[PDB]
Amino acid sequence: NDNPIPKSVPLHPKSGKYFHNLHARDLSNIYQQCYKQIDETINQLVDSTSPSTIGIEEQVADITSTYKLLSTYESESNSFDEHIKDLKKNFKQSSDACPQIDLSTWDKYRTGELTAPKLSELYLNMPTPEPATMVNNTDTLKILKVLPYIWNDPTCVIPDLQNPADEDDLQIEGGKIELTCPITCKPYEAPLISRKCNHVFDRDGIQNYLQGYTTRDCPQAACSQVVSMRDFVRDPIMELRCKIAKMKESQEQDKRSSQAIDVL
């Protein structure tokens, strides 16, 4: 009507060139660089704070909030790109469905009696991104959450699935997790744990037990299962505990020696 400017027209092959050219610009490299940066910052912070200094809980909470915000950003960016591709597919299908303007179909579209899909309206009507079907649980997040307790004491039992207060009401009765293996009187240089056994092993003597037998029972108690080589994975918690224990024992030995010399 009036000025012959139709609201929308069917897609053209020349316009199809640009439609295929249009894409959402990526953040995969940016996101992975950010993730690696925050992970290495957490790793540095693990031993960065002075052993006598206490109160890393607020910094841990702040870093947890930062990581959660980053993960939410990544999830909604994935939502962005999937929405973009779905919108492109819907628009191309609608354009293919609609006819082509040759003689007066353009006039009909201009008069408004005929309508064609418009990417602007579709992008205005696309649903807002939703952080659904996404879980903010990573190994870095887990170690970040559990590191304050390890800092407080090397032996801790954080899970509260059985009871929110502790493992059993107020008393854990969980014993201690020893850095030095009775089998191998040495710190765990290769901490390997099973998703089923949930026990950390040095693997130096475990390979000797697992050679010649396809599956062998877990030597530790409180469980009964057989595992192979490929069920073992690296557990950062174990060497985190080892490092904090060594650092604390070094600082306490230095303090006691210095005070004893000050006595003389």
Add this chain to the structure above:
Amino acid sequence: IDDQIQQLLLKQRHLLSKMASSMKSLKNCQKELISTQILQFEAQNMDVS
């Protein structure tokens, strides 16, 4: 040394917050790039037709 370490930790957490702020600002830039571009693409299709 401990005071300097604490100051560096505070500085690095401040930079972490700053780069978190730059995050989703980069996403808003990405959205304002992809948006207002499809409208001009529609104008290009208008010209082509």
